[PDB]
Amino acid sequence: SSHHHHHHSMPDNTIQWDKDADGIVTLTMDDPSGSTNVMNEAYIESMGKAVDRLVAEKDSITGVVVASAKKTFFAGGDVKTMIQARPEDAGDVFNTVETIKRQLRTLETLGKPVVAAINGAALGGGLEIALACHHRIAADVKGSQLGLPEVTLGLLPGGGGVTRTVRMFGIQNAFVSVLAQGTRFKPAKAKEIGLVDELVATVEELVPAAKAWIKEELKANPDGAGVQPWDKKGYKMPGGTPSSPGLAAILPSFPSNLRKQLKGAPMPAPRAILAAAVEGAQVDFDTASRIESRYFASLVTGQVAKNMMQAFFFDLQAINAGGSRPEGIGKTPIKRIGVLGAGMMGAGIAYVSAKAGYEVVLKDVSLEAAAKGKGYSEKLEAKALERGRTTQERSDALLARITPTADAADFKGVDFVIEAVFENQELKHKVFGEIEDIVEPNAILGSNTSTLPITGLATGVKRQEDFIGIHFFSPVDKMPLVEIIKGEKTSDEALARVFDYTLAIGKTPIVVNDSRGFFTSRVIGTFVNEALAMLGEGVEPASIEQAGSQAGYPAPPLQLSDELNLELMHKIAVATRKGVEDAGGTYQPHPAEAVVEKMIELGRSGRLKGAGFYEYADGKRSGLWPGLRETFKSGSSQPPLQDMIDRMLFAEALETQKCLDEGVLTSTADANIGSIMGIGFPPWTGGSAQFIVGYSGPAGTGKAAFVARARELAAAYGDRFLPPESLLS
Amino acid sequence: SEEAFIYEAIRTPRGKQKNGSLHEVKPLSLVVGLIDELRKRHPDLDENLISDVILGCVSPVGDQGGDIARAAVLASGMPVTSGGVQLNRFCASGLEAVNTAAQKVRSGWDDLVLAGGVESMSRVPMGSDGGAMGLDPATNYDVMFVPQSIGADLIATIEGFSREDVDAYALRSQQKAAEAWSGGYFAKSVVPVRDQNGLLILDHDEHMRPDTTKEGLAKLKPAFLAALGGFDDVALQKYHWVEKINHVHTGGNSSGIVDGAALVMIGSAAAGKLQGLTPRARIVATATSGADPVIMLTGPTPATRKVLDRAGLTVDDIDLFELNEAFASVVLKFQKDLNIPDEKLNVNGGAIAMGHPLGATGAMILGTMVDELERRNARRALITLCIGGGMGVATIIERV
Amino acid sequence: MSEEAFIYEAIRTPRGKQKNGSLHEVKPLSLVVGLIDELRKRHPDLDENLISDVILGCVSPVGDQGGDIARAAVLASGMPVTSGGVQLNRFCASGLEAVNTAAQKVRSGWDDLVLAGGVESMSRVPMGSDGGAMGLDPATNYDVMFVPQSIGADLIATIEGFSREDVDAYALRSQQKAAEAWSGGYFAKSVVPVRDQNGLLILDHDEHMRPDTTKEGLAKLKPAFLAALGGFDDVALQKYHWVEKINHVHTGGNSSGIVDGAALVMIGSAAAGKLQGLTPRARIVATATSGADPVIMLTGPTPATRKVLDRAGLTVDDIDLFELNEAFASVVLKFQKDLNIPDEKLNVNGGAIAMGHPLGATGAMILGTMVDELERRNARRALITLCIGGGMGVATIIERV
């Protein structure tokens, strides 16, 4: 019954009030405690005062314009408060979003036109405010985005974002294209899909254009002015309501399709979005709005939301804020970038280095075989010109930054070297000892290795303080993580200059101390080995794939094993054997290596050879090799599916703890982001380190329940699941 | 307690879906036509003894809404004290109405009860009533909803029934249905549908394709709410050991969409002697069970064991078996699990040839086994039906 | 008779009103599942595999209430997949027909422990949404002389001579006895409040009640808020040809309220109750079904009440409490007049005029109300009966154990 959070017996004020001689109130949002407008306790009270004043002065108001005094329009909420919401705080969570929506609902049913002047990014709570208005104008300014990306933090649009979009575009279109994945749109795309009505050039002409639309709307459409389509007498929802015979025919197929795209992963946010969208389309707008709040409070108090907010907000900020950056060091600009090696990996490095406005000197052996590296850069730009994501001027200056060559003398000015020739430690030593003297003394000499330690390679250079390990993933154009491997000789400055380079090419950097397999390659090995171990124990191979997909992984393990050659796994299984057997230590082989060698003996090495755990024809994946069940006696061991899911998640989580114990990783934020974006650890966990503190099962929730379940797996599947002492007392 | 006998059991012919003869007939008249046929058989019957009319209807909506059993009582001029209740247990609605009528008589508080079903699927298609499991995502998501058509293909994939194995059964159902019609097995129970003038509308089950060949069945393309994405991947998320679903079911080996109705009179022995009626069969036992809702149609297997356990009988003591032919693989699995003899199963053909009028199929395949036990002079029969949502119902009768 | 049917539990949801109702945001499936989960709290160690069937009455089985909502409640609540599930519709007595059928199934010996009840979300699924043969078959509407239950009640008041004051005097009596029962705490153990997915309260009381009802306010109301369409007065009088003019005495203040709600009743044999450690609360002594003329429609409880008295070999004085669903004020006034029922034994804890008439769930609600009022008074027997559309009637005698 109130517009305010409290109603019994002191925050700042965010909104400025400007009424003109016409009677148009201009609500300019300007939060003095931060350079961005955000949905905190200050806004809710500030908008409460503004809406109450709109009603008490309605006899002298002709229309409302909502703008912002920041470079952005509005973005997000107070994440530091929402991550603390407990299940007994569901009443407070419910009342808060209900208060937020009653404000927008009064502003929406004011009887007067309300226009949103979107001067920049309008995300989450920002687009939800603009959706309550009757008209939306956005400036085609650079950096502006529009969308409802709450689902990427384990949440849903709870400020009317679900109720209004499903009511503007129908159930199917709103869920698929806007709600289910939180897709972010540029203003040109937003005006096409219907989120935005008009477009202007600069932000200077937004408020004048908004007032010009209010004046025209009152003249031409005097009755329907300030009336949303669903508040009219003859409103019909696009695609029909769940009562419509056309929609009710395909309506049962929506939850089944959601289980297909999520592969059965326990991600409850898209489930709640689809449920609030359909149940809301069955009732009136106000009852639909309240159903949206109850599903919203069900996610905020849940654990999966706390996992995602930890990884995709706090942990990702602490990394981009220069957490793993050495203290106090400044920047040294990267003039020319020498990318030694022009294979599949070498091409992607030069592309993302050229797409960042830096000059590249691609160098290889055959000018013919080194033209494929620039041909890969043109294969992407030609696809981008067709999609309209880049211009010919922007695409030619990019390829002009790339300077394909083969002369070692063309390095007079290069201060940054990445080697991605191929893998052989002795062969790496000699090829490195070539450009060291040709480049300037402040030139970094990187290397792309997956398992070979850096400190051993660093001996083949004089300036060992500048020998570093920059590990990219395939394909480099899309993979966002860059694993920077710190050797024993690498200095504080040489590491920081690589940390600054990663953020410049728009990627996520983590810093890792020198070790065998480092972090990404080492943890992903326990994931595939645990699955092949299950295959040898007699588990159905189809059950192994279903366990990997329902766990939340992007690719099932047996399928992933064929994508990274089984003989490549065997070679690493020997390099690690020689590694321990040279430090006076014996090597206990993983039970998966018997499966790897049994497949290699059978002549099924993976995808390149054309036969692995799957069969491959026409370049595509056909199905599981039918003789696989007979070879490993599949069906003899039938454990429950939840034990298979846990065996794969616990192996990676315990291996992450062994990395944090050995000083391989410095902070837990790098462990989460490294696992999520590097090897594909399921995002609902929030990272392989958050998975421990955020575990949840029949044994409870927290580190203690994780230890209990880890020991429960140890007594039934092996002592590799016993937890380290760092998780114990 | 009190024994419940079957005194009469009739049914209309089954008109096909596309260009059907019964499409112009309201589903209420399909029942009123059968009430008038019972009157013609027993004119001196005191209809005030009939204490209830229990009709099964899976889609009680529109033409079939508003308690069509009460509309049948009023429109047919029956005594206004004769009640009238509609129920819905999916495919077993026709059999559950009979079982409930037999259970009400066994409890003693009811003397003579009409029971049966009705479903005009050409006028009120399946799923026209909306549904909670379907048109609500939160429940559709948690219970892992999947249609019967997918679950039937999964039964064929798990049990190894090939496309030829299920199409060979559909041929057998077409032949036994054509051979039964020729011998006049149905001439007494199939009451032809007429209009208000007495003109003939339908006197035979027009869904039958008696000239079906093994070659013609092979050219049929598989029909797998299906053809909408999702349901294949949902079933494999629960049956994670199965890799791919072998879609073997077509329109030729699955039950037919038809219109029809059936009626079964049930009463105690005292109600029979007092009205001068000849008891034809005795309800020996009934049972309710079910199985996994994602495989759905494996409910008849524990429901048949539960009803043989109540009657203290075995598979040997049952002379005739009658399982509804919703899908060919469902009947084959039933034959394999219980080791049913081949010459005892659906001896007069099934729903693949004649059709599956949902809410009335239970009372049709029951009245078929009453006819056959008399014609063969056999002793016992067992009738069961698979159900959506993973349920199962079974009933044992004995000739008198 | 060998296996007697007993009542072990009987719960119901609070009844939310139609306009601005508190239960309009709750799906009718959620109402049933909440009552299933409450029976789990009261008996956590019950072997639910003993539960052989779930029978739910529902008069509008379409939309949210379609697709055998009894079977949807079995799957959604997580009950064993062998626990059956069937929806039936006998108009207003669908809730009691489920309880009676569950009792007949227990007596027949082929069911051990059965759940029975009803659900009706009239604010989401209004009455008449399930189509109907009448209207869609004018040849049948014309032949059976269809008259809605509203006019039939006005016709009963005209023939028996029940004034506007007479029907409003009962409406005030129902409001007063409901507020006294509520504040007295009679419904504390049976009315299970409705909560959301976060545990927050949605409703905990019968919000259709207007406990501050006065004689004067009931006289300011207006009659008959389909009934306002032409014909039905003439169609009813063409059947009851000796009446000259129908006195419209019924309003929204003396007619049953349009509400949302659901109810559940656990019924089983004495052997099954001892097996699961349950304590029986009542016994199903006898059930009867009859009917009266289909034009006046509402009458029917009287020949069914007399039928259930002869089946149990009892008289009116042997029955301690009488409970008739207050679909309309004149219907209960005629029922008391015909069988000469004392005022004190008739709808003692109020009725549908004050608390509501959730169509399919009413029969299971008023029955569960009598189970509590028998124990609270230490009385012996109670008679539950309901008027039905179309002209039917259902009665049931229960005896406290």
Ligand SMILES: O=S(=O)(O)c1ccc(Br)cc1
């Ligand atoms: O409870 S409050 O209304 O102060 C509130 C809580 C969380 C967020 Br994010 C904003 C405001």
Ligand SMILES: O=S(=O)(O)c1ccc(Br)cc1
């Ligand atoms: O109870 S809290 O103050 O933690 C709270 C958190 C999130 C929201 Br939205 C509202 C309230």
Ligand SMILES: O=S(=O)(O)c1ccc(Br)cc1
């Ligand atoms: O901008 S977002 O939609 O990603 C967003 C962020 C934090 C919170 Br609290 C709510 C929303």
